[PDB]
Amino acid sequence: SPLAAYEVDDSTGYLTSDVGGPIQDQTSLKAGIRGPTLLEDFMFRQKIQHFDHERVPERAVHARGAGAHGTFTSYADWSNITAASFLNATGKQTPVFVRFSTVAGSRGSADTARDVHGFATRFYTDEGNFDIVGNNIPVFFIQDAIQFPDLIHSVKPRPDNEIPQAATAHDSAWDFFSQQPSTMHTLFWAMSGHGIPRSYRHMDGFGCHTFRFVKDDGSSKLIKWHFKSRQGKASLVWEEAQVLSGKNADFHRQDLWDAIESGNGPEWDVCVQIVDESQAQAFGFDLLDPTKIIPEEYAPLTKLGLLKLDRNPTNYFAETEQVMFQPGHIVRGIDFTEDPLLQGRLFSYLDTQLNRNGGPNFEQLPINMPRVPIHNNNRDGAGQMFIHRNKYPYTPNTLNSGYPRQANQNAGRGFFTAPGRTASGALVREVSPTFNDHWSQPRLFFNSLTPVEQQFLVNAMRFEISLVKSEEVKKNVLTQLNRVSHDVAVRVAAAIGLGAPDADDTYYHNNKTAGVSIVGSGPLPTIKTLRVGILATTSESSALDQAAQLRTRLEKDGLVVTVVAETLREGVDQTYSTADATGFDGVVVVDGAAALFASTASSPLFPTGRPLQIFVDAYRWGKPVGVCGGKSSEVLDAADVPEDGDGVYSEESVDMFVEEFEKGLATFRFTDRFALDS
Amino acid sequence: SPLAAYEVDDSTGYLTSDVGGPIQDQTSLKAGIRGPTLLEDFMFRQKIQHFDHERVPERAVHARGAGAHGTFTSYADWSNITAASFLNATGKQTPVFVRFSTVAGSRGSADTARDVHGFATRFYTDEGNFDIVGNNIPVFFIQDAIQFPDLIHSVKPRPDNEIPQAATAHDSAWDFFSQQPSTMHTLFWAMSGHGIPRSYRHMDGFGCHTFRFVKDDGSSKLIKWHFKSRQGKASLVWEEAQVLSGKNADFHRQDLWDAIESGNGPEWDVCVQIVDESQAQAFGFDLLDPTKIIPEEYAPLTKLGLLKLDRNPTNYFAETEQVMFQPGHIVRGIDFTEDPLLQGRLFSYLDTQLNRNGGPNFEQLPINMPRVPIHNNNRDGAGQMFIHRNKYPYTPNTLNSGYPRQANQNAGRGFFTAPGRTASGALVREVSPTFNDHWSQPRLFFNSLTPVEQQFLVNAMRFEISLVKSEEVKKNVLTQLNRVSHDVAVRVAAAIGLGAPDADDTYYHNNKTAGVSIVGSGPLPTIKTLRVGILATTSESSALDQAAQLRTRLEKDGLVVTVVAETLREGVDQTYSTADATGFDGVVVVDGAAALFASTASSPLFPTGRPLQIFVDAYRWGKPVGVCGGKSSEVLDAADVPEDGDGVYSEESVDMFVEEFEKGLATFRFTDRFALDS
Amino acid sequence: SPLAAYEVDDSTGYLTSDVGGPIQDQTSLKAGIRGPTLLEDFMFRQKIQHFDHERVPERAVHARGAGAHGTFTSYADWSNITAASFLNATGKQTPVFVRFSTVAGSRGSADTARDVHGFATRFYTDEGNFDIVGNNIPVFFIQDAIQFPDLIHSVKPRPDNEIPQAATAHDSAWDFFSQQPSTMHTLFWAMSGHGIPRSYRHMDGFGCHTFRFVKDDGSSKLIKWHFKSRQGKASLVWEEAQVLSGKNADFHRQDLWDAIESGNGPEWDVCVQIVDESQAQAFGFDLLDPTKIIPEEYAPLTKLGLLKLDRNPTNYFAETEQVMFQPGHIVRGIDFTEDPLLQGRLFSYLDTQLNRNGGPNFEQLPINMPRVPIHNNNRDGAGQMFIHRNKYPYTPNTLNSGYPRQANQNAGRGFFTAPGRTASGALVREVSPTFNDHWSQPRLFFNSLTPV
Numbered sequence A, B: 001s002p003l004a005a006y007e008v009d010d011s012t013g014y015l016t017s018d019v020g021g022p023i024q025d026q027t028s029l030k031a032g033i034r035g036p037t038l039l040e041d042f043m044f045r046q047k048i049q050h051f052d053h054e055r056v057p058e059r060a061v062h063a064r065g066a067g068a069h070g071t072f073t074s075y076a077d078w079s080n081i082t083a084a085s086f087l088n089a090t091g092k093q094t095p096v097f098v099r100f101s102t103v104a105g106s107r108g109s110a111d112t113a114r115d116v117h118g119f120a121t122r123f124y125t126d127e128g129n130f131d132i133v134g135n136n137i138p139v140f141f142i143q144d145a146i147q148f149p150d151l152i153h154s155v156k157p158r159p160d161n162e163i164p165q166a167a168t169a170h171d172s173a174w175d176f177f178s179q180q181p182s183t184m185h186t187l188f189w190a191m192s193g194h195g196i197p198r199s200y201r202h203m204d205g206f207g208c209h210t211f212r213f214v215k216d217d218g219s220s221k222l223i224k225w226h227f228k229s230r231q232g233k234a235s236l237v238w239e240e241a242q243v244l245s246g247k248n249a250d251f252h253r254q255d256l257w258d259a260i261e262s263g264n265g266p267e268w269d270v271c272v273q274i275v276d277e278s279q280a281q282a283f284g285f286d287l288l289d290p291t292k293i294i295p296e297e298y299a300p301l302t303k304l305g306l307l308k309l310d311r312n313p314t315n316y317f318a319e320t321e322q323v324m325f326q327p328g329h330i331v332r333g334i335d336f337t338e339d340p341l342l343q344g345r346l347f348s349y350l351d352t353q354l355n356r357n358g359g360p361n362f363e364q365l366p367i368n369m370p371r372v373p374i375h376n377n378n379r380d381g382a383g384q385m386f387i388h389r390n391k392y393p394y395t396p397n398t399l400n401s402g403y404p405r406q407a408n409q410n411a412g413r414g415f416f417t418a419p420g421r422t423a424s425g426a427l428v429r430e431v432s433p434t435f436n437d438h439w440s441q442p443r444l445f446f447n448s449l450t451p452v453e454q455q456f457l458v459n460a461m462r463f464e465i466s467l468v469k470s471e472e473v474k475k476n477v478l479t480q481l482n483r484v485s486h487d488v489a490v491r492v493a494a495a496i497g498l499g500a501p502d503a504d505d506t507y508y509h510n511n512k513t514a515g516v517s518i519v520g521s522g523p524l525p526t527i528k529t530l531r532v533g534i535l536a537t538t539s540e541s542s543a544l545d546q547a548a549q550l551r552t553r554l555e556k557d558g559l560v561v562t563v564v565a566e567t568l569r570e571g572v573d574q575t576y577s578t579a580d581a582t583g584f585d586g587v588v589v590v591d592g593a594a595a596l597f598a599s600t601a602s603s604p605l606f607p608t609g610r611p612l613q614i615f616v617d618a619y620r621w622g623k624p625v626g627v628c629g630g631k632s633s634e635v636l637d638a639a640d641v642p643e644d645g646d647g648v649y650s651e652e653s654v655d656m657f658v659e660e661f662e663k664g665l666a667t668f669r670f671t672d673r674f675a676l677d678s
Numbered sequence C: 001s002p003l004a005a006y007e008v009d010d011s012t013g014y015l016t017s018d019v020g021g022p023i024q025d026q027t028s029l030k031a032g033i034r035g036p037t038l039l040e041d042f043m044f045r046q047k048i049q050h051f052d053h054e055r056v057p058e059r060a061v062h063a064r065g066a067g068a069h070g071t072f073t074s075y076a077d078w079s080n081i082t083a084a085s086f087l088n089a090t091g092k093q094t095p096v097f098v099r100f101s102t103v104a105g106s107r108g109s110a111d112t113a114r115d116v117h118g119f120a121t122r123f124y125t126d127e128g129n130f131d132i133v134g135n136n137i138p139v140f141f142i143q144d145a146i147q148f149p150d151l152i153h154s155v156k157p158r159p160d161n162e163i164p165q166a167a168t169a170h171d172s173a174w175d176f177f178s179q180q181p182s183t184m185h186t187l188f189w190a191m192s193g194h195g196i197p198r199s200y201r202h203m204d205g206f207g208c209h210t211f212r213f214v215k216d217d218g219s220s221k222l223i224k225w226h227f228k229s230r231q232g233k234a235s236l237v238w239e240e241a242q243v244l245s246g247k248n249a250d251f252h253r254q255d256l257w258d259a260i261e262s263g264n265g266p267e268w269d270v271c272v273q274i275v276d277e278s279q280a281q282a283f284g285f286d287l288l289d290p291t292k293i294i295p296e297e298y299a300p301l302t303k304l305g306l307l308k309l310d311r312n313p314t315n316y317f318a319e320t321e322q323v324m325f326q327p328g329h330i331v332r333g334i335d336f337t338e339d340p341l342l343q344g345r346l347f348s349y350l351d352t353q354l355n356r357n358g359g360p361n362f363e364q365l366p367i368n369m370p371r372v373p374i375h376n377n378n379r380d381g382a383g384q385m386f387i388h389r390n391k392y393p394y395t396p397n398t399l400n401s402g403y404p405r406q407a408n409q410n411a412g413r414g415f416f417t418a419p420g421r422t423a424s425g426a427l428v429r430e431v432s433p434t435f436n437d438h439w440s441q442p443r444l445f446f447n448s449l450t451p452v
């Protein structure tokens, strides 16, 4: 609907060429009924030419992702800190488009790879398009944009054989990380549950860089952007994420699309940390360094407004694939900082759209068009859609009466550089010594996780580093991890049968910070959209009756209910053959189906043991599990699940069962089921 | 109109980026007032990126050209001969766009090169876009499209040094013509005045190929398209074309522009020759052979409707440079023939737009869009401007209720191949022996020219062949010309110091045909838009009054009058310094200006002898010339122009002078001034 | 090898720009140690421009795949059945490059999706490059190339949300299969273990179409290509393939890489079925119909030679990603048939390389070059890597003494269309009634499987 002017309806009508000539497209024109195809068959060639040219280059990074439309609403008049028009009044609404993504994988790689994630937001403001091109992790691997190809070459597949897909679990990546210590902070985030979010809706967005807010009086403040999920934070566990990558490569895009269609459009508070220009080096690190967070204990979050996604695209290629974000899409009231990573991005995102679009008029694509008039002297170029009436597109002119007029701080609401900004010194290719502590903040992060969260991060490193062939690289990795934490180095080293190097306490400390832990961020604030699998049977009409009664009670509370049985019929959504524990946030067995959980059970309709394996996987991955109806022993014993376990439910009463189970869905994960290093 | 929706008005407002952010664009962002430019200057980079990417590849042929909008109006309901919708009712109006061109020259080459000319017409019909991609010469150089790169390589500049521009006057071209005898018919046309038309408005358009008119009953006839100029046929002379190339490379595009802006938009009758399928070999040649005309004595012209061009473009690049014509843009009621030159064109014009546009969505450019709904399953591609609502773009489908519907002869006004058409025989790379007479029709054409017109054609060949460096190429040319006409070969041979081969009478004949002569086509039917230069002086008030009185007389009759004097002032349009005889169709000297024609005349304000040169050039080139006043003989003596001469006017009276002079403008050229061979 | 000349060694040396100027690439040039980056930093911009432009469009189909180098060796002089030079002597070796693939998935999708698989083989022959662009299933879903976008739109992800990846398990695909009954034969194969082969080495290759072998005397026979695996045939089971998709998306490409690195390079017997022109309709179906096999009981396989893959690429992008196969890459001794699926392929594979390469000189990429001299009047175009010495590139010419000379059946070992080929009848957009049995051969295939 925001792009309704560009929609093409094909719900009626005869087939036409692109120039409106009615045609057919099902049989080639031939010299005789068993003859060769004719070159004069224009119907054939226009259709096949289009098909042959459908593809465009995937994004150089963040190739795998999914988007949606929505609205941003300001909570206040923020004039007192920024001239930004979209923030200038309480309740002011601006249309948005967001794309979420992974980083390393190509198109069609799995959503549930371990990775950094993108969170890119376009505000179609009444003073121009403004993009915040963020990630779900607030810190970046590297401190200078010129290193971006080094990082990305090292994490993408080895270039002789293009193995492995969508993974850091290979020699080159860990060679880079161990040789470039700046990488430690993002690496620890990626190896945490932040690397495998439960959904795009259960992760935050961060600008990463320090930006400026600039008032109409020319004064500036330094900001960090934080988009704080109103769904809660949640993660997968790795051994779930790996199966999910195979069972449903589309899991995150499907979760987002389904949340919007069900009227559960995800929300974020758009927030900033706001500090003075004088505080650039006040917090024990440099605000120009994109490997550092401002601990919330030093600068609290100010809520600016609400971001809500509530409308799926009409055509994925035209809207999601083609959206071309840029940090250069900036508006009056915002400015850059001298963060050398941000600085180089400004070049990269304008240039790379020439590769994707194949020509310079990419801002004319509907998804990239602003929602206000364009007045400039840009002309021509391949794919030019506009027919410009001004035949004097040069400044200064008299023959077009001096239009367009120059916009600046004092006229026409121009963008302007923060006028207090200066530079001084030598023209240098030198790194600021203020950037040199690569280890304190990774230790800050690690210290701020719960004990089983710390175990999960150690286990992710054990997983990946064990797949590194080079004994030299593994030793170098242990040298770097040891500078963050001797305990991490020892525990990782144990899995790969190397010794950790001796403790080096230069950067060790016991400081913690709020709001980085997933396991610690408490029960989810809402269970709406969470997925309940009810394992039933067609062999017992009472099992289907139990499942129907559970469905009614769970759907009332906005849970997405799947009834599973051997075969489809009224009231059954999936077969056992297509069901997997990765498709549910909790699993309920109706006790009328207990016979399908016996070690004897076999059917040509699903793989051997599938009903019990769904229950066992869900338990072993930490999910709420239980048996509804009062006869729980046969199922729980077959699964080796204790009836007294936390997040294990057994009730005759459907109402009592659902009340208990719903508390478990909010807890989301039962971390007592994971072993800890001593 | 898809054009009106994309018009952009910059007559007011502040400068913005392409995403609507107000900006400036006159000073770079620098680290200090004398400092280096910053990479974060997005204003600089988006502007210069656009500039850097303004250009697109020129067309591989017909790169130099100019276009205009207009209307086609049917004279009748032509249902009796064609199903074509745009021809189905008296007075039915269809919008058009026409581009005219040369062939060989690049962009910026001169309009008045000697060349074949394009005349490409798009009919934006209510059943799809229909293009007739024609030339001003009815026959083409070659008989199979596979040879097109051979012809074009040979006539385009030599590929080691890219010399010479926009000319056949070089060894390679005449090597190809002499080795590929099919070329003789078009070569004779290009060496006639048809190679140097006076304007786009003073030439005809030809489809060249035989096409089919197909009725809704499936029956077909064979047709040739003729667009017959209502302005009359007129040529330049070669020496005039050479000077005009230098003095005004834009002569034809300016002539067209100006005629439209003055309310003198050019007109053609869109005509066909119509013959039965049984006549394909009945006229002594094969109607599939694009080197042959149907003599009008065998098949008269039927007038179908009026083509008028009456609106100039708004943006040349967006409309004229980007228009992408295709013979594949066909509509129900028209069909192809098995002409091997037409057959391969169908492939070329779809493919080549990928090169120009850089992507497959070129039909979405406003100038290329149809005027009717588009319904098809073409998707994606770079530059996709649509948002398709049908998420099941495959046939056959049930999920989109079987839409779009297949269109064909029976349903949906589908295009259909003429159902009488067959093929039979071996799959061959063989030329039809019916194509083998390369010489009879060139001789018919030559025989049909007037004596002075024959001399101009011999003189164009003498000019060009004398610049061929290879004695052997020259001999081979004479061999080929001699098979058309011994007299042509003898006369051309005399200029290059070779002997002509002995007469070879195999293809010699004395037959003539109507309607191919320019010199024989009689006075122009209208003198509106023709240019009169009045050569005056600021010295004598009487000269300026004489000029102002002629101006009033002549402008009354729609003549574009230029008063020329030493310097500009009220009533004087042009200085002697910028004036040339190639700027005028007729030249008048006011007798008050006689002093400027003396041999001792000199001025820092114009080159020595300029005023007399303009008069003497106009006279040499055949134009109507005269002295208005009462002295008369002084100027005519200076010019050695005889007062009794045809198209030489001497009148004291402004009224007698103008009545006489305007008859000379209709006669247009006085051919008695050109010497003939003995 | 045109690849040898283009190998670039970076085992030693100082970093340079692409024009050989020694540079650094680790720190941006800034106005002071905490200052903004300068526009004059050419080191930064050349490196980042390259990075920004690394990607090219994935293949419109078969986007997910992997390749290797090897050798074809002829078992005999096959002059008695074809003029093809690569088959004209016992022991004659020809270098090859093969790419294997799925069909529907994008780049990065899993190897072990259920799908049809590509098996595309380039023979760098002494009379030109010859490609056999085949699949692991001998029959195709559709009977006319004009329907290919319909099939592919229906199997690829739904276009509002781009779900699901690399799968036919969705409404649109089964809508198309149920509305277009031609699809049944390939669908049965895709739903068999042939949809989830154990490895690229454990599957066969098929040309699918009937082609022609043409002798120097102009006579022709109808052939089918069969590449028969020496490793045997093997499949995954589905519940295994689904887990493997997640645990190792690269399983087939690693399996191939490892087998070559260990000296276990995979082998196929390159075989044909050979039948007379007069048998086009003799077997109860039409040999022009690409939904039909010739049962081996009616026509046995002749072994022509050995294909072995024994060398991994050096640079996956340069070699595997950029290899551009075409059934139009044909050599003297082979000809097309009037199979309406093959007929349209010939158009598609030449055109689509313009999308992938961005310009017309894609045959100049080292992996696409031939191993004989090129003599033609093709010129210019973006990315022109040749410096042509012939300044008269038109035929007919005298100024280059008539060179290059036309090649044909009687000159220069030219390609020639089989001279017994004819066409008769109306110019029609009509399906042959001989194509109308969509169900018997799917039944034959199903009958031929074991109960499990």
Ligand code: HDD
Pocket (backbone or CB within 6 Å): A059, A060, A061, A062, A065, A099, A100, A101, A117, A118, A119, A120, A133, A134, A135, A140, A144, A145, A146, A148, A206, A207, A208, A209, A290, A323, A324, A325, A341, A342, A344, A345, A348, A349, A352, A353, C048, C052
């Ligand atoms: C110098 C280069 C460079 C650097 C240092 C970064 N990126 Fe970037 N990024 C690109 C160069 C790039 C790119 C090559 O220009 C991409 C590819 C597609 C595109 O439009 O821009 C891109 C895409 C891209 C996308 C996908 C946008 C979409 O969905 O279409 C996100 C979310 C980010 N990046 C986020 C980041 C963040 C949070 C960074 C550090 C704080 C970051 N990038 C550093």
Ligand code: HDD
Pocket (backbone or CB within 6 Å): B059, B060, B061, B062, B065, B099, B100, B101, B117, B118, B119, B120, B133, B134, B135, B140, B144, B145, B146, B148, B206, B207, B208, B209, B290, B323, B324, B325, B341, B342, B344, B345, B348, B349, B350, B352, B353
């Ligand atoms: C096999 C190739 C081939 C052959 C045999 C021809 N042409 Fe052509 N022509 C082209 C290949 C082409 C092209 C390369 O496809 C062009 C370049 C730009 C374009 O759109 O198509 C073209 C452009 C072009 C244009 C310019 C259209 C415009 O103003 O944009 C005209 C008027 C003609 N041609 C006319 C003809 C006529 C009357 C021909 C013979 C009767 C003819 N051409 C044969």
Ligand code: HDD
Pocket (backbone or CB within 6 Å): A048, A052, C059, C060, C061, C062, C065, C099, C100, C101, C117, C118, C119, C120, C133, C134, C135, C140, C144, C145, C146, C148, C206, C207, C208, C209, C290, C323, C324, C325, C341, C342, C344, C345, C348, C349, C350, C352, C353
């Ligand atoms: C009319 C279109 C059309 C039809 C009917 C087919 N294809 Fe195709 N195929 C293409 C259009 C295409 C293409 C769009 O042109 C591709 C994409 C990439 C490329 O080079 O060609 C392609 C790629 C492609 C590849 C990948 C080559 C590589 O690894 O790079 C294989 C193996 C096949 N196809 C095999 C087949 C088989 C065995 C077919 C039927 C018997 C078939 N295709 C029908």
Ligand SMILES: [Ca+2]
Pocket (backbone or CB within 6 Å): A158, A170, A171, A172, A173
């Ligand atoms: Ca590696």
Ligand SMILES: [Ca+2]
Pocket (backbone or CB within 6 Å): A192, A193, A194, A235, A236, A453, A456, A518, A519
């Ligand atoms: Ca976690």
Ligand SMILES: [Ca+2]
Pocket (backbone or CB within 6 Å): B157, B158, B170, B171, B172, B173
């Ligand atoms: Ca030459």
Ligand SMILES: [Ca+2]
Pocket (backbone or CB within 6 Å): B192, B193, B194, B235, B236, B453, B456, B518, B519
């Ligand atoms: Ca003339």
Ligand SMILES: [Ca+2]
Pocket (backbone or CB within 6 Å): B415, B416, B417, C428, C429
């Ligand atoms: Ca038809």
Ligand SMILES: [Ca+2]
Pocket (backbone or CB within 6 Å): C158, C170, C171, C172, C173
């Ligand atoms: Ca679907």
Ligand SMILES: [Ca+2]
Pocket (backbone or CB within 6 Å): C192, C193, C194, C235, C236
């Ligand atoms: Ca099997």
Ligand SMILES: [Ca+2]
Pocket (backbone or CB within 6 Å): A358, B358, C358
């Ligand atoms: Ca391009």
Ligand SMILES: [Ca+2]
Pocket (backbone or CB within 6 Å): B428, B429, C415, C416, C417
């Ligand atoms: Ca042939």
